[model samples]
Target: GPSSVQLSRGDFHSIFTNKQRYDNPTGGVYQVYNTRRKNLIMISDGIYHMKALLRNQAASKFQSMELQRGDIIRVIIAEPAIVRERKKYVLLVDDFELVQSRADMVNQTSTFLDNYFSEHPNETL
Candidate 1:
């Protein structure tokens, strides 16, 4: 079972700005341990390891059966956004994608989504 962990907004700022958090360099496999649950969640590779850990749904959607353990999925972690009173940082998984030939263009969808949010502050996305 997945544990519901709380990451404060300050923690998010520290990770992104200070770069002093648990970060996998570029593309590295890592294990995330849940001390409370007494288990380890394996992040098998770099790309799949990058996105914010919202829940199993996003992770499952990012993974496919074709990808075996230790295989890397080249995905870009969209910049985290504050939701529900800026308590935690979360990803806009709708815009998340595997790396393509033109990865830059593909990743720009996230930026577009950000701009859309900026323009429509009142709309619930």
Candidate 2:
């Protein structure tokens, strides 16, 4: 691992959607959300309303290709036991690795988590 690295919770081997890119004077920013976990990952400036995957996170490659909604990605972290804040950015060890998953599984996970969170309004990590 590089001198600077952070591991995310489990590998993000799920569907990512609502991908949006923004270019600013500082640099380009990419935003993607997990359909299953209901989390967001912003490569640059972002105002997060819910739990975020990566925050202030850094990566040399950042993003190598155009990320589209429904793309499957596996986000690996250097450490998973470390309890970090949900409001800050976490660096990625590498570029987003697009993966494959069944649509039914993705939708089921999404629905389950969505409903779980809705039912338990105060539970947050």
Top-TM-score candidate index: 2
User: Cα lDDT of all candidates, in order?
Assistant: 0.29, 0.28
Candidate 2 per-residue C-alpha lDDT over 8-120 given as tens digits, one digit per residue, 9 for 90 to 100: 22222111111121111111122233323222342211222122343223232234334433333444332211122322223232334444322111221222333333454
Flag regions of model 1 displaced more than 4 Å: 1-15, 18-72, 84-86, 93-125
Please give the lDDT score at residue 81 for candidate 2.
Answer: 17
Best by lDDT: 1
TM-score of 1: 0.25
**How does residue 56 of candidate 1 score in lDDT?**
44
* Residue-level error in angstroms, candidate 2, position 65: 1.9
| lDDT for 125 (candidate 1) | 28
